[PDB]
From Swiss-Prot:
Changing residue 26 to E: Complete loss of activity at neutral pH; covalently bound substrate. The lineage of its organism: Viruses, Duplodnaviria, Heunggongvirae, Uroviricota, Caudoviricetes. Its EC number is 3.2.1.17. It is found in: Host cytoplasm. Its main location: host cell. Substrate binds at residues 32, 104, 117, 132. Induction: Expressed late in the viral replication. The gene is E. Keywords: Antimicrobial, Bacteriolytic enzyme, Cytolysis, Glycosidase, Host cell lysis by virus, Host cytoplasm, Hydrolase, Viral release from host cell. This is Endolysin. It comes from Enterobacteria phage T4. One of its GO terms (biological process) is viral release from host cell by cytolysis.
Length: 162
């Protein structure tokens, strides 16, 4: 287990081009290809990115690859964020992962909105934090994910993704 499978599960992996919600070409784990409106452009970018003639279709490794980037980006977002940073730093691999998970789903800003939680997390009150997120729209909106993420903050294991 790792963040890639973690996210493979939470969000999902499409291995072929797709127009996201707002019409944009994406692939793998929400890896956006182009904002432009040309498939050829999406394709080109992919093919560039992947280092071969994908033809719009990729493998999971490739996806990983692509993913490993989005990840790097997210972290940089976190660390640039005066609220998220301290937390990120206090965290252990797994917990960071759980944070990246959230970040990945609601944006650095969103995640940023949970004051207490972050605090508590910062202080190592995994459990309370968890308890605390349980009581949020989030928890109520995508309960299946939230639960896992939540438990993750509490347990600090991948126990929930097995
Ligand atoms: Cl697919
Ligand atoms: Cl809060």
């Amino acid at each position: 287990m790792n963040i890639f499978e973690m996210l493979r599960i939470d969000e999902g992996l499409r291995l072929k081009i797709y127009k996201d919600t707002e019409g944009y070409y994406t692939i793998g784990i929400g890896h956006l290809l182009t904002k432009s409106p040309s498939l050829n452009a999406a394709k080109s970018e992919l093919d560039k990115a992947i280092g071969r003639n994908t033809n719009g279709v990729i493998t999971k490794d490739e996806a990983e690859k692509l993913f490993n980037q989005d990840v790097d980006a997210a972290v940089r977002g976190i660390l640039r964020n005066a609220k998220l940073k301290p937390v990120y730093d206090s965290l252990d691999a797994v917990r960071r992962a759980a944070l990246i998970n959230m970040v990945f789903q609601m944006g650095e800003t969103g995640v940023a909105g949970f004051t207490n939680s972050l605090r508590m997390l910062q202080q190592k009150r995994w459990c309370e934090a968890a308890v605390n997120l349980a009581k949020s729209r989030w928890y109520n909106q995508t309960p299946n994910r939230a639960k896992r993420v939540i438990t993750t903050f509490c347990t600090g294991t991948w126990d929930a993704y097995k």
